[PDB]
Design a protein around this ligand. Structure first.
Ligand SMILES: CC(C)[C@H](C)[C@@H](O)[C@H](O)[C@@H](C)[C@H]1CC[C@H]2[C@@H]3COC(=O)[C@H]4C[C@H](O)[C@H](O)C[C@]4(C)[C@H]3CC[C@]12C
Length: 1179
């Protein structure tokens, strides 16, 4: 870290007033409970000692009952000024911190984002590094003066009332403070392994849904519901050891608390007998020391957060004051009257300042004629990506000069130079703002007329009107994700608005289809006229339109000519041979109601009924654990009553008895606290395992189209099965154990209260809920109010994360201050809410603490009123008060019930909607026609019409009639694919045809059950798909009982035995993300070998393109030959040599098949057709 006192470097006039008030109001609040104890110790004394004079009893109890109404008013006005003046004086600082961080973070030169700090590291420093700082100066500095003043004032009132009893308590506190620290560390040692064991076993569902296409293609989907259950037991046996360590950490805290009070009370009963101590002063000292002695554990997080908030604050202050390395505010920058578009480059040598050894630019000399179309054509890595940055002057040249009308770049003003240059990037840059503000970045002062003119030139105003909101259409989280062509058109319109004289087209349409580029190119051509423009094209059509073509080679200009001059030198030149890898880059890449939320509880708690022997031995340990929080507060008051008896002989006999219950029935709290938390952790841990695999057995049952709804992504079913299944643990088992535990407490408190005096046990019950409601707020104060810091600043941070990441586009235009202005204005709406939240949470806590102490001035006065009128006395009216008022601080365990308590039916609806989801394709359909033995295997199709269910508009198949012969070959080929593969999907019944018939040996496939017809199809996916397990169990994923010889045969036939046996481990070699990575030409081999383990009659060899190894294919072709040896093979390929041995070759284009036959039959009727003309396109 940097230092303390450096975090408060953004303070202003109000930040020395809010901290100067929230430090006095938090110090007065801290020293108010150890003073209420002092007042209580004096009220009781003048309430039992003056039994012979009721008259003095009444003016000396009313006074101390009116002091309570002042102690409770000094907390209403002292908790308001602490909770509200600390959450606001941190919000006023951590906002000016973030504004400065962003303003000085995109001011840095682009070298900074590569040489020193990654572009993804900075976005982290706003998400978390600006939250760790705020939480350690707003809410955790105020919880430090409070818990230090409480500790300081916990000894002044203790050692000055009865010092001889305040030392025994000091000799006791460091025992509770050690047991309660060991228990909270043993729990953390076990709460960090369950997550590991649930995320190592929770990746099975992550992997399964990604490759559901091959998981469902084979029947091995029952191998994913038992490799997912046998990996949950690891997190279940470990989930049983958390309950035991939670019960033996609460049965040992009470075993110490009872014993220590079994000695403090005896010593207090010894002091009183010898006349050194009052009756109440021996009680408000044990409490006052233990309150001020345990007030250091709550001061541990406050100092633990002061260390993280400096190692997380040094990074921000590093960037904030770091001066850049280029003189941006260039007052020493020359100016030019009017440019003519003349650019010269002479002897420019440059290298990246990340590996200063390459020579990307060597002895570069190039002249840019004014008003002409100079195009850059070359291979990857031969330049055309550094010269564009150098004219923009992103990196200053290492050695060399660039002349723009005869003056050096290091001599003009940077902001003016970047004003006359128009840059169009290959990705459009849009920020979280409206369409209108996304174009004003070009120039601020433009009116609406010019913007609309530019938009209608940009082929943009056509769909602007079609958009509902028009120019105010908010692009960002909303905005329906407009198309890439439209995205490019907005940026192009922004470029026209700037109206530059020099234009840099760097890969304008390098990643769009021919439809959008058709619209874009003509607009660029209209915007081309009258401008010195340098185009880096990707298609030869624009190069044909280019005036000059200067081809770089190894960073130097090699070939200079035109479109026609360069092509005249034949294939021997680079210009003609560039077509081969130019045109190949296109085809290859292409709400409650008590009836809906009652079934959710009740249907859930019916399948959780094989375990009633464990939910019935947890309602006993919850009753004799709630009957001991009332047999302790009752003894703690029955000792106070006997302190005032004038007969010392009788007083000892009762102190002895009550010191033998707190020692005796302490083992009954040690034992019965390991039956409540150790038997409610078996009921609540087997329900989750049963509900986490009922969903998987249903997610593995939906239709193939259900996974293409764009809501069922890869890691979002895995998130629903891991975040909506951990909230069911706290719904049944963890809430019956709190209702019963607290029902068994108010039945032992209100019995011992009603037996003695029923006129006081009725009044105290009437104001009983306002005591527990006030005490719960005393435990939701330690964690802190206004949590969840990062989600409040989640709308503005999108602008930061999309603006600093696209720093090049931000700095190309001079919009480095017009984004700070947009980022400041999106932080005030949270700043007008975090203040009212602080006021509300301050007032609602102040009033709920005044109304608590106002209820201690109504019981203690009514007792004194009863005593005068001869109804009761001090003995009976002080047990009723103390029992009923301490079994409300002992009744505040409703805070400690894994306090979720509200996700409830909100999370429970998703679980039961997934279970109750129907499937229109039955995976295993009973009452079905029977499946024969080894069949003929003759696939036939009849008038097939088909389209994707997601897009039912484009009918791809239109009366598709095709028949696979009796096991010979049905090679399907054709150009313009992406839809040819639908025959593969139709046969495995992934999708349902719109209209048609699928005959297998002359029979419809809907009459067959789905899980047996798949015992005869062998699928080979195009993309190498091997699961994260060793080689042995990837090949074995195609059968049931695979012997060693069978797998060895499968490996040998696919030519995989040699390589696998050549590996170090052998068949046991581990493959996957966390292991060995192999070559794709071999990963296809393993897939083919897996295919020949089924011994199927129908083989669906999908395309194996995007891989070339002639020696590998020399064996792969014959491996396919015996893979096609008398078996019905429908092969879809791209290379015509692979279909030379095909018996039936079908050409499928424009949705129909017309050219069918073999090599001899097709070349006879179609000697000049597509099948014959595609041939010559390329020992
Ligand atoms: C009814 C009132 C007159 C009475 C003073 C009462 O309000 C009082 O504030 C009660 C609720 C508190 C004050 C101090 C508390 C105790 C604080 O000191 C203790 O010994 C701790 C130790 C341990 O952490 C126990 O879990 C709670 C336990 C044992 C608390 C039990 C409840 C109290 C005794």
């Amino acid at each position: 870290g940097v230092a303390f006192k450096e975090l408060f470097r953004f303070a202003d006039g109000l930040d020395y007033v809010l901290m100067g008030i929230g430090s006095v109001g938090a110090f007065v609040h801290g020293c108010s409970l150890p003073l209420f104890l002092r007042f209580f110790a004096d009220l009781v004394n003048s309430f039992g000692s003056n039994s012979n004079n009721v008259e003095k009893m009444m003016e000396e109890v009313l006074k101390y009952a009116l002091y309570f109404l002042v102690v409770g008013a000094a907390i209403w006005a002292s908790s308001w000024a602490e909770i509200s003046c600390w959450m606001w004086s941190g919000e006023r600082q951590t906002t000016k911190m973030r504004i400065k961080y962003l303003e000085a973070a995109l001011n840095q030169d682009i070298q900074f984002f590569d040489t020193e700090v990654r572009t993804s590291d900075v976005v982290f420093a706003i998400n978390t590094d600006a939250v760790m700082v705020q939480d350690a100066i707003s809410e955790k500095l105020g919880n430090f003066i409070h818990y230090m003043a409480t500790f300081v004032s916990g000894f002044i009132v203790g050692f000055t009332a009865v010092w001889q009893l305040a030392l025994v308590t000091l000799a006791v506190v460091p025992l509770i403070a050690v047991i309660g620290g060991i228990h909270t560390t043993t729990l953390s040692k076990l709460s960090n392994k369950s997550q590991e064991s649930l995320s190592q076993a929770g990746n099975i569902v992550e992997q399964t849904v990604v490759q559901i296409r091959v998981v469902m293609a084979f029947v091995g989907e029952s191998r994913a519901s038992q490799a997912y259950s046998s990996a949950l037991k690891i997190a279940q046996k470990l989930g049983y050891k958390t309950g035991l360590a939670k019960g033996m950490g609460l049965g040992a805290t009470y075993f110490v608390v009872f014993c220590c009070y079994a000695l403090l009370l005896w010593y207090g009963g010894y002091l009183v007998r010898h006349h050194l101590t009052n009756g109440g002063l021996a009680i408000a000292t044990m409490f006052a020391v233990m309150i001020g002695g345990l007030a250091l554990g709550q001061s541990a997080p406050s100092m633990a957060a002061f260390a993280k908030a400096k190692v997380a604050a040094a990074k921000i202050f590093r960037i904030i004051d770091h001066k850049p390395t280029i003189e941006r505010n260039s007052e020493s920058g020359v100016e030019l009257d009017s440019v003519t578009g003349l650019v010269e480059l002479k002897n420019v040598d440059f290298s990246y300042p990340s590996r200063p050894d390459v020579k990307i630019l060597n002895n570069f000399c190039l002249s840019v004629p004014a008003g002409k179309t100079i195009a850059l054509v070359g291979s990857s890595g031969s330049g055309k990506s550094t010269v564009v940055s150098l004219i923009e002057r992103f990196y200053d040249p290492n050695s060399g000069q660039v002349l723009l009308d005869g003056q050096d770049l290091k001599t003009l003003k940077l902001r003016w130079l970047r004003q006359q240059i128009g840059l169009v990037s290959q990705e459009p840059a849009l920020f979280a703002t409206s369409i209108k503000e996304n174009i004003l970045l070009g120039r601020p002062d433009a009116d609406q007329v010019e913007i609309e003119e530019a938009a209608r030139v940009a082929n943009a105003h056509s769909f602007i009107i079609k958009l509902p909101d028009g120019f105010d259409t908010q692009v960002g989280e909303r905005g329906l994700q407009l198309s890439g062509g439209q995205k490019q058109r907005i940026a192009i319109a922004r470029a026209m608005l700037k109206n530059p004289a020099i234009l840099l087209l760097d890969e304008a349409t390098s990643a769009l289809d021919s439809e959008s580029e058709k619209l874009v190119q003509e607009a660029l051509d209209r915007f081309m006229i009258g401008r010195t423009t340098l185009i880096i094209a990707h298609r030869l059509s624009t190069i044909r339109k280019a005036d000059l073509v200067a081809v770089l080679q190894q960073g130097s200009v090699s070939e200079i000519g035109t479109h026609d001059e360069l092509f005249s030198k034949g294939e021997n030149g680079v210009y003609a041979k560039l077509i081969k890898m130019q045109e190949a880059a296109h085809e290859t890449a292409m709400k409650l109601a008590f009836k809906d939320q009652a079934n959710s509880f009740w249907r859930l708690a019916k399948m959780n009924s094989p375990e009633w022997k464990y939910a019935l031995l947890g309602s006993v340990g919850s009753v004799i654990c709630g009957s001991l929080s009332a047999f302790f507060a009752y003894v703690l008051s029955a000792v106070l009553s006997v302190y005032y008896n004038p007969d010392h002989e009788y007083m000892i006999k009762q102190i002895d008895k009550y010191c033998y219950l707190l020692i005796g029935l302490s083992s009954a709290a040690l034992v019965f606290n390991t039956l409540q938390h150790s038997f409610w952790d078996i009921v609540g841990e087997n329900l989750t395992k049963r509900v986490r695999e009922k969903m998987l057995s249903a997610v593995l049952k939906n239709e193939m189209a259900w996974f293409d709804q764009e809501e069922n992504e890869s890691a979002r079913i895995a998130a629903r099965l891991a975040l909506d299944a951990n909230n069911v643990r706290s719904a049944i088992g963890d809430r019956i154990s709190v209702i019963v535990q607290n029902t068994a407490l108010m039945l032992v408190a209100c019995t011992a209260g009603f037996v003695l005096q029923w006129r006081l046990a009725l009044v105290l019950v009437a104001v009983f809920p306002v005591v527990v409601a006030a005490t719960v707020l005393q435990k939701m104060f330690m964690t802190g109010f206004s949590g969840d810091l990062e989600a409040a600043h989640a709308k503005g941070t999108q602008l930061a994360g999309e603006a600093i990441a696209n720093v090049r586009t931000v700095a190309a235009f001079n919009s480095e201050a017009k984004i700070v202005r947009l980022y400041t204005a999106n932080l005030e709406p949270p700043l007008k809410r975090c203040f009212w939240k602080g006021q509300i949470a301050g007032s609602g806590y102040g009033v709920a603490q005044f109304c608590l102490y106002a209820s201690y001035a109504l019981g203690l006065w009514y007792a004194s009123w009863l005593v005068k009128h001869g109804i009761s006395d001090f003995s009976k009216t002080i047990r009723v008060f103390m029992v009923l008022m301490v079994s409300a601080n002992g009744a505040a365990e409703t805070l400690t019930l894994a306090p979720d308590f509200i996700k409830g039916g909100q999370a429970m609806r998703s679980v039961f909607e997934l279970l109750d989801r129907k499937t229109e394709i039955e995976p295993d359909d009973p009452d079905t026609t029977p499946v024969p033995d080894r069949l003929r295997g003759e696939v036939e199709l009849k008038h097939i019409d088909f389209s994707y269910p997601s897009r039912p508009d484009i009918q791809i198949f239109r009366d598709l009639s095709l028949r696979a012969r009796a096991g010979k070959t049905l090679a399907l080929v054709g150009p313009s694919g992406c839809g040819k593969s639908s025959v593969i999907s139709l046969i495995q019944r992934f999708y349902e045809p719109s209209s048609g018939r699928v005959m297998i040996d002359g029979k419809d496939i809907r009459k067959y059950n789905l899980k047996a017809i798949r015992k005869h199809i062998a699928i080979v996916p195009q993309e190498p798909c091997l699961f994260g397990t060793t080689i042995y169990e990837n090949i074995a994923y195609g059968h049931e009982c695979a012997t060693e010889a069978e797998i060895i045969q499968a490996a040998t036939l696919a030519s995989a035995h040699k390589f696998i046996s050549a590996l170090p481990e052998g068949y046991k070699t581990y493959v996957g993300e966390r292991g060995v990575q192999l070559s794709g030409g071999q990963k296809q081999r393993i897939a083919i070998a897996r295919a020949l383990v089924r011994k199927a009659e129908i083989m669906l060899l999908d395309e194996a393109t995007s891989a070339l190894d002639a020696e590998s294919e020399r064996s792969v072709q014959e491996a396919l030959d015996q893979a096609c040896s008398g078996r019905t093979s429908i092969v879809v390929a791209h290379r015509l040599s692979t279909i030379r041995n095909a018996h039936v070759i079908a050409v499928i284009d424009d949705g129909k098949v017309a050219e069918q036959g073999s090599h001899s039959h097709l070349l006879k009727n179609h000697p000049d057709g597509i099948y014959a003309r595609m041939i010559q396109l390329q020992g």
